[PDB]
Design a protein around this ligand. Structure first.
Ligand code: 42C
Length: 217
């Protein structure tokens, strides 16, 4: 159940952290960017599979804050990940760079748009999270759970059964010095800055006292 990151992924994580060390808020931009790519992925698949959305009819990205439990949730109803995809897509490299990141970093150029361009921004979550939990269900597999603290990662079958229907949930156990992102006004502002150009609706579980979703894009 326990795996070690591929060495190249260990290096990529450090390069992404050092590049976005001064602008940690970018992690939420990438999580949104990733959630869109997953939704964009299942929508293309729906053009060829009439039952690709049977597990879940909505195509949304929903965000929840839990100040009491110190958690931040980013859920998308996209294509999702199988057990094998949780291990390979997150633990190794398998798409399409390291010299370019080093060259831009060594020659002192900016790389924020470079990480979001290749879609490796998932690891920027470790800028604000002590642990990253990924719950995902793919139409061709059962719902699994992926956990990591940047030192290793594990995958287990979700004992709660099929809860998501289809999609992924990125759960971040925010650090002690990242509780600023537990407040609502800061999250809603950050979400709106990065979710305008996403072709899918973005909801945030806010309060007013009753609670409900709030559209941001
Ligand atoms: C992390 N990664 C590459 C992902 N793969 C598939 N669906 C996702 N939804 C959010 N991130 C996702």
């Amino acid at each position: 159940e326990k795996f070690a990151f591929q060495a190249e992924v260990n290096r990529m994580m450090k390069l992404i952290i050092n590049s976005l060390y001064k602008n940690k808020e970018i992690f939420l931009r990438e999580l949104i960017s990733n959630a869109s790519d997953a939704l964009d992925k299942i929508r293309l698949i729906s053009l060829t599979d009439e039952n690709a959305l049977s597990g879940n009819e909505e195509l949304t990205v929903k965000i929840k804050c839990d100040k009491e439990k110190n958690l931040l949730h980013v859920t998308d109803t996209g294509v999702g990940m199988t057990r094998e995809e949780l291990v390979k897509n997150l633990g190794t490299i398998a798409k399409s760079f390291l010299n370019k990141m080093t060259e831009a970093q060594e020659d002192g150029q900016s790389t924020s748009e470079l990480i979001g361009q290749f879609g490796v921004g998932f690891y920027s979550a470790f800028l604000v999270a002590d642990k990253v939990i990924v719950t995902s269900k793919h139409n061709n597999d059962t719902q699994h759970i992926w956990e990591s603290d940047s030192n290793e990662f594990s995958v287990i079958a979700d004992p709660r059964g099929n809860t998501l229907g289809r999609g992924t949930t990125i759960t971040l156990v925010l650090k002690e010095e990242a509780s600023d992102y537990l407040e609502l006004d800061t999250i809603k502002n950050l979400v709106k800055k990065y979710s305008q150009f996403i072709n899918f609706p973005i909801y945030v579980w806010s309060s007013k006292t009753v609670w409900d979703w709030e559209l941001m894009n």
